[PDB]
Design a protein around this ligand. Structure first.
Ligand SMILES: Cc1ccc2oc(=O)cc(O)c2c1
Ligand SMILES: Cc1ccc2oc(=O)cc(O)c2c1
Ligand SMILES: Cc1ccc2oc(=O)cc(O)c2c1
Ligand SMILES: Cc1ccc2oc(=O)cc(O)c2c1
Lengths: 158, 156, 158, 157, 156, 157
């Protein structure tokens, strides 16, 4: 009965995120992707972000996607789990991630496992992908095909 | 007669800060905790922050608490000192602290000494403590008792 | 059927290592502690290192201890697994750990999950503990009680 | 026909930036300083002021020119027939963010990024920290070119 | 006429090194790869290392390969240049590279430009490649073809 | 009666070390430079040579003295009735290892460690890199005190 939670805002989900989802799903019996509700409203609504993740994780039967707000550790514990799996990329503020991990262990006994994303997906972030795409750069190799079309949709209607 | 200034916003003071204050007070004849007034906007007023620090440092007779505005090195030099003691924790932007230390030495001849807080208090920050408490997380092991009491009152 | 391998030389095992073992054992169905055979001979023989780990992990029923040499990924794969759990402490060469993790994923498809050890055990390493103990410093709070007595035994016979 | 672009907001240019400009000009046939403007956020100096301050402090570098732009840096670079960026490193540089941007810029446009550490003397100055210190009266005159220092004090007063 | 030196032991040259050589050769009129002779002890001789690099850089007409001993900045200045191009990868000790760059500028006026290797080649190093291959791991995607062939021969 | 210990192997002392000594002496009533010796590995200079080179370059600091030792630094500190260490930071410092040692030293002996960044001008010198550069003829004379430079060249020849 093992399980982990993969948290983020995923605005939008990238192949970097998907890589981490896949590895978590391969090593734990159950995975929950936790989508942050946090009113800065990004580019996509929470429902849009959930849909894009669900579309991209259809081949992962033991993964589900749910939104949450408030403490991540509450999200995790209320589902009977006590592990978080967090991806590392180029540009990750790792010191802040370590601070949060130690706090989350202290207040709720939740462990955090870090995994580095694949080199190919190591320089994409949701923010940098949006920025580049806004100015006409090609990020199609860095996002799930579906996500990519939706992004083009939000820009070419702004 | 030696001396150092321990600067910060302390909104609120944490056990991480207190550990650093204690070590400064043990190693310098005089310590001044400098509480930043930033009119560009916290949870506690400057007077409340000063009072919380005084409560937590009651056993440190050579330490005093004062508010300050503007350039830290002016605050330091105006009190006849030229040393700053700054704590390090998990999540400290140390490269930025180093930049500021080298700047502060250049513009005023003020030295900065860094000390790592104890491992037990190394992941608390004023910001993260407030964030956790807001959502009902228990940070009472990470703050002085009087601070935790006031924090609950501000949220309730 | 989940599982992970916790690698190291463990010369000797510390409470930092034990903390990581406990977390791995709490989140995976099966854990193997892999003790490196690598002729620099340390302070303890491989058998001594294994014994000290077994003594300290008696309350972890799903953990076992085995020695290995050669590629870690071969050790992992030959046991039907493809995950490593590695602890982080103060003084960990994380950049080198990241390099090895990406190489190990490339050559064998093995994932590496990193977890930070508890703040209390974050400044102990096998090397620093031996060094301090050699010169008469008290490291009793940083090592399993058994390990501590064995260490005193190897120094007070040198 | 070698060449590189040295990008930044230069609000204002510092001696740390000039050090990097000088090194780039010594090592590439032509250097273009790219003054990158966010049309949605004003800084302290206007684009013409920024360019004037850079020109005045680079008059001894005959193979360097200064131009403004916005949008993608790699478009600015490729439109001038170049494909190299030279970026300085200082104390407080977010190097991981720079690396992320360098890898992204290579991926989307094939443009290379070369990093060079600025001289130790100029390694703790940044435009933002210089402005902050000067705002409260601190002496930053040794860290900025003459073309900048009193213009800065003028803005603040 | 611009130019730079790309230094290393290259024991053996990797695709990480080659990526950096290619970028240097694209941006400078002349590039010299400087192969370190260290009489304090590798797997390949200097002649073998030079030959492996030449095979891998056959398409780069403005790049040449030479061995060198002693101070890198002397090697650079003796060839009428004053720039070094050094690659960064995962596991690079960048603080030490920065120290050496500042030293090299101080003692000889030589600039050092750093470039990150491509993500695909970012975790290979000569040392880790040899270590993995010794135990039968497949690093053929990380080395030039001719290099991988020789490596197998040295181990067998 | 404040005081601190400044530890190192000082083989040889550099201007980066002297900068730190000077700052410690300006901020503590007494400073002891601790020349820590490994009885199992000789360096370039003998302990008496190391101490002589430090004394000659610190003659203007009346509240500083120099002593050698071995074993645990915290024992050296506590035997002099002190409980503070002042350690310099430079480019290339393994800061994580220093932090590990500082936390261990607090744990086992209650001794505090204060870190200070050395001046930018002296931030890239280390004893080992100075020796390596000088070995192959590079000019390190601006990075070492006069008490050191020609003694170093003497050892190498
Ligand atoms: C409840 C919840 C869900 C997702 C989250 O994702 C994050 O990246 C950070 C959070 O604090 C978080 C919290
Ligand atoms: C005048 C004053 C007082 C306290 C401070 O505290 C800080 O953390 C940063 C400052 O610049 C500062 C300045
Ligand atoms: C086969 C084996 C076992 C344990 C190990 O432990 C390590 O820390 C590093 C290794 O490469 C390793 C390899
Ligand atoms: C003369 C020479 C040639 C190649 C080198 O390569 C290096 O990686 C470091 C050196 O100091 C060096 C020196």
């Amino acid at each position: 009965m093992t399980g982990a939670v993969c948290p983020g805002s995923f605005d939008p989900v990238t192949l970097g995120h998907l890589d981490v989802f896949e590895r978590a799903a391969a090593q734990f019996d159950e995975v929950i992707v936790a989508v942050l509700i946090n009113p800065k409203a990004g580019m996509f609504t929470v429902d849009e972000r959930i849909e894009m993740i669900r579309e991209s994780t259809a081949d992962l039967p033991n993964l589900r996607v749910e939104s949450g707000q408030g403490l991540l550790v509450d999200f995790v514990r209320e589902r009977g789990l006590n592990a978080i799996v967090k991806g590392l990329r180029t540009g990750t503020d790792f010191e802040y991630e370590l601070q949060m991990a130690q706090m989350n262990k202290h207040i709720a006994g939740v462990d955090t496992f870090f995994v580095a994303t694949a080199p190919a997906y190591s320089f994409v972030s949701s923010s940098l992908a949006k920025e580049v795409a806004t100015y006409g750069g090609d990020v199609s190799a860095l996002l799930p095909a579906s996500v990519h079309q939706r992004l083009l949709g939000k820009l070419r209607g702004q």
